[PDB]
Design an enzyme around this catalytic site. Sequence first.
Site, short mmCIF file in Angstrom:
data_model
loop_
_atom_site.label_atom_id
_atom_site.label_comp_id
_atom_site.label_asym_id
_atom_site.label_seq_id
_atom_site.Cartn_x
_atom_site.Cartn_y
_atom_site.Cartn_z
N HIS A 51 4.79 -33.26 3.39
CA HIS A 51 4.43 -32.39 4.50
C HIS A 51 4.04 -33.17 5.76
O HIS A 51 2.87 -33.26 6.10
CB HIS A 51 3.26 -31.50 4.04
CG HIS A 51 2.99 -30.33 4.95
ND1 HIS A 51 2.37 -30.47 6.18
CD2 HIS A 51 3.25 -29.01 4.80
CE1 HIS A 51 2.27 -29.28 6.74
NE2 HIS A 51 2.80 -28.38 5.93
N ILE A 57 1.73 -34.02 8.67
CA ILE A 57 0.91 -32.93 9.21
C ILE A 57 0.03 -32.42 8.08
O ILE A 57 0.54 -32.01 7.04
CB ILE A 57 1.76 -31.73 9.71
CG1 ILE A 57 2.85 -32.18 10.70
CG2 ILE A 57 0.85 -30.69 10.36
CD1 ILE A 57 2.33 -32.73 11.99
N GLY A 60 -2.21 -26.60 7.15
CA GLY A 60 -3.19 -25.66 7.66
C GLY A 60 -3.97 -24.95 6.55
O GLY A 60 -5.16 -24.69 6.69
N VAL A 61 -3.29 -24.64 5.45
CA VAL A 61 -3.95 -23.96 4.34
C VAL A 61 -5.00 -24.87 3.69
O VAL A 61 -6.00 -24.40 3.17
CB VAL A 61 -2.93 -23.47 3.28
CG1 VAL A 61 -2.01 -22.42 3.91
CG2 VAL A 61 -2.12 -24.63 2.72
N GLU A 65 -9.05 -24.41 3.03
CA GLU A 65 -9.62 -24.72 1.73
C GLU A 65 -10.84 -25.63 1.93
O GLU A 65 -11.85 -25.50 1.24
CB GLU A 65 -8.56 -25.41 0.85
CG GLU A 65 -9.02 -25.92 -0.52
CD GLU A 65 -9.56 -24.83 -1.41
OE1 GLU A 65 -9.10 -23.67 -1.28
OE2 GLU A 65 -10.43 -25.13 -2.25
O1 LIG Z 1 -2.11 -26.21 14.70
C1 LIG Z 1 -0.93 -26.25 15.05
C2 LIG Z 1 -0.57 -25.82 16.32
C3 LIG Z 1 0.77 -25.89 16.71
C4 LIG Z 1 1.72 -26.39 15.84
O2 LIG Z 1 2.90 -26.45 16.19
C5 LIG Z 1 1.36 -26.82 14.57
C6 LIG Z 1 2.32 -27.29 13.68
O3 LIG Z 1 3.62 -27.38 14.06
C7 LIG Z 1 1.94 -27.69 12.40
C8 LIG Z 1 0.61 -27.62 12.01
C9 LIG Z 1 -0.35 -27.15 12.90
C10 LIG Z 1 0.02 -26.75 14.18
CL LIG Z 2 0.67 -26.40 8.10
#
Ligand SMILES: O=C1C=CC(=O)c2c(O)cccc21
Ligand SMILES: [Cl-]
Lengths: 152, 150, 149, 152, 150, 152
Positions: A51, A57, A60-61, A65
């Site tokens: 990822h 990156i 986000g999940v 958590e």
């Molecule tokens: O937090 C994000 C804001 C924009 C964005 O494009 C993004 C992303 O592409 C992958 C993870 C988080 C973000």
């Molecule tokens: Cl993400």
Amino acid sequence: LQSQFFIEHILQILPHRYPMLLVDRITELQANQKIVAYKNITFNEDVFNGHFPNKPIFPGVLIVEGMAQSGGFLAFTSLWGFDPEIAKTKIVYFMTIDKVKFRIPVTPGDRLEYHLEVLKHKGMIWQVGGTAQVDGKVVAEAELKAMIAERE
Amino acid sequence: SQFFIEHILQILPHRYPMLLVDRITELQANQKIVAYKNITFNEDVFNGHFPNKPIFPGVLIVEGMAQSGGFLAFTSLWGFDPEIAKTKIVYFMTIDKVKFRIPVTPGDRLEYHLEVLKHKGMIWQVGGTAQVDGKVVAEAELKAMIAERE
Amino acid sequence: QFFIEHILQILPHRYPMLLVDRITELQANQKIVAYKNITFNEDVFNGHFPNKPIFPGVLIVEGMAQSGGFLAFTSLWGFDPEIAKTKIVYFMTIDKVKFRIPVTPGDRLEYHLEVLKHKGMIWQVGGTAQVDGKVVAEAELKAMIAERE
Amino acid sequence: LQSQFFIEHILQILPHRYPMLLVDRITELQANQKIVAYKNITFNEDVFNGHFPNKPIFPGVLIVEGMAQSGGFLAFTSLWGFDPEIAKTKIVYFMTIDKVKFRIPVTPGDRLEYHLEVLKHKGMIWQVGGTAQVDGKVVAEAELKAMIAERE
Amino acid sequence: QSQFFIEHILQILPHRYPMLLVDRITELQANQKIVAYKNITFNEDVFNGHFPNKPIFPGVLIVEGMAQSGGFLAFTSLWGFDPEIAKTKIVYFMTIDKVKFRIPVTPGDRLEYHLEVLKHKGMIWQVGGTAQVDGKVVAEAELKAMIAER
Amino acid sequence: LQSQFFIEHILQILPHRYPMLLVDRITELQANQKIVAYKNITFNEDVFNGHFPNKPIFPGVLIVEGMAQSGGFLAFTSLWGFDPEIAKTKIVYFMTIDKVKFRIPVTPGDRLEYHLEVLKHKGMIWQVGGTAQVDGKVVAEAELKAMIAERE
Ligand SMILES: O=C1C=CC(=O)c2c(O)cccc21
Ligand SMILES: [Cl-]
Ligand SMILES: O=C1C=CC(=O)c2c(O)cccc21
Ligand SMILES: [Cl-]
Ligand SMILES: [Cl-]
Ligand SMILES: [Cl-]
Ligand SMILES: [Cl-]
Ligand SMILES: [Cl-]
């Protein structure tokens, strides 16, 4: 109850272990009110193998958590203080998650700071809300209600 | 309408251990998708969630629904196009109304059901449930944005 | 039925070598039906093979052996976690194995084993591995249960 | 066609990768006839976390897999010689396994030596048989038939 | 004893996967020297990144293995094969010096550690020696450690 | 040649990959002279599963490795600038390590800062020396010599 806790103390309270223990240190803690903790983000994490390839990156999940685990630590310690023996018999579960917004991507080298605050609490039910921050900027926001349940 | 892991690997940039969709069983452009991920004990995540009590993380169920939604949104616009797939990225802006009703464990076939709530341009809003053997184990709504890679 | 938690109480195998997620049928000294889900989220697929996920045939056999092992433990001592925690299992022989269909992510790998012969800690079973009703593999094997030390 | 190959040479021929590339070095190879190779066994391998806790024992099924990969290398080089370009798009499927007998448990610190001989081969279908050895003693015996196929 | 296998090593050193880098002890003379080794196989996670298409056992890990061997020597010298006492001790490594790498180590190699006690004063132990592959010196180093309560 | 590089830039220069790429970001860089970089330490790293159970301590030898990688990044950009194309044809070999001291244990939640200066350098042979710091305190010291070589 103290306001600073390190990985050694976090391990005695949360049941989470590798690769799902996403809180490295607690810098602020106020019973029934709030907690400020963080998790360092390094490239040396298995999650980044997928990822994403060549574009690390932090999911986000997993940020969410991390916020929930912080919330869980706050909820438990607010009720029983720093009690490893009892912690060993309880476990926090996600009931709901709302108003989650991702504003900025989290990457290796980042210090993912969790800022949770108690919106409502009655017994074993806790509603917390807050943000995830990197060098003062809000990278994410979220609200969730958890339950302190029996482990067995 | 039925895509297997190989096809999935050509559309989604996700790789181990973050590709959480094993097979697509249904797909109606601009409308809905049904897909699933098998849950087995042989997954690294279970080493810590939790020791002596394996429970697929609720957040990963949501991630699974997002990946399904993104696959839905992408194919709806460009179909099964590997080449274009490499030039676009689908990241999530929001997630709302998440509810977990039943724990998911090794042995379960985690089924994702997402429908397009609305879409305008590259902003797509999908929603639905996570199902195991006919029962709703989770539900959530997500908003995604399709953008040019880079 | 026996779930992961129950399987963990009997079989000594652990990650990433525990390849049975659930037991659906159990008949002492007779047969056993169990299965393992196959998902892309398994480490083996990183190397078998890159860009072409194929559950290793040898792991299908391992899964059948473990199923047979669970049948052996319980036929011998019943569901007894205490005695189980002192044992491990060794593979003795493998024979007559044939692979017919590749097992891939998304498959529900079902194990069907029956007792061919047994004595003491030595058990010989045989059967098939199935995906959606079709035989994807056949095998016979003999395993031995022994004290941890 | 050389007679000794190292990990770099094996990587260019066999499609297997971590954690399923179980051949570290080839010590002798006779085209369309026999191959001798080996894999070092160390505690520092992931399978040991689960087979078994506190008692590391290299899985019998992985010894067979190792013998199979040794056969595959023999099979491929006997067909096209040492050609990485032709090799990079091939895979190897197990077809049958017979008469395997495990005599001695293999543990960390062992040098698992594979000795395979071609029993019969036709086109892409090779049937090899042999033993796995540790310090000159036979720890396992096996017969197997594998097929080399173009990825599609 | 003089020859200890993995089961024994596991009861004396606290190190576990993926940081237990000693598979077997072949020679041990209390307060003098220890000969042990670790097999190097491609099936190790470390090779995924060091380096792609060019598997080379990290030089720093050769030194770690030597340090671990020195610790087993030190510990067994004080209390012999005692698992119970082992759980109550720790060997902090304070310094590392004069390390030279002469030959790269790769999958298929039997990395042999040769360490001797250079000086032992109180809780401080100074060990030094070489790492060898098939009779040839592949690396050398000196290390100083301290014994203390865990 | 700028003075700050993030993980995407480090990936394009250093050949190290998971789980041996131990530098997350570069903060200061003076060609042929010095470099300051860091690696975040998180509990979510596989290495902690074995070093040690119930007591995560970042291995001293990996801190040295981290300093070496920082040095290598300095060396390469000094001779070729930010050139991903040429970087892909190289690896780095540790030649010697001297005067290393481990003063303070490193744990999850720490920001392991690498400070290295060029002691000597000619051709592909670079000799650096410096410290590893956490919140301004010296946690470790080391000197090392590496060589950039054609991966042939
Ligand atoms: O937090 C994000 C804001 C924009 C964005 O494009 C993004 C992303 O592409 C992958 C993870 C988080 C973000
Ligand atoms: Cl993400
Ligand atoms: O904590 C220890 C670190 C290294 C080591 O070798 C050791 C040991 O050999 C016995 C007890 C503790 C330790
Ligand atoms: Cl959960
Ligand atoms: Cl196969
Ligand atoms: Cl076995
Ligand atoms: Cl090195
Ligand atoms: Cl250390």
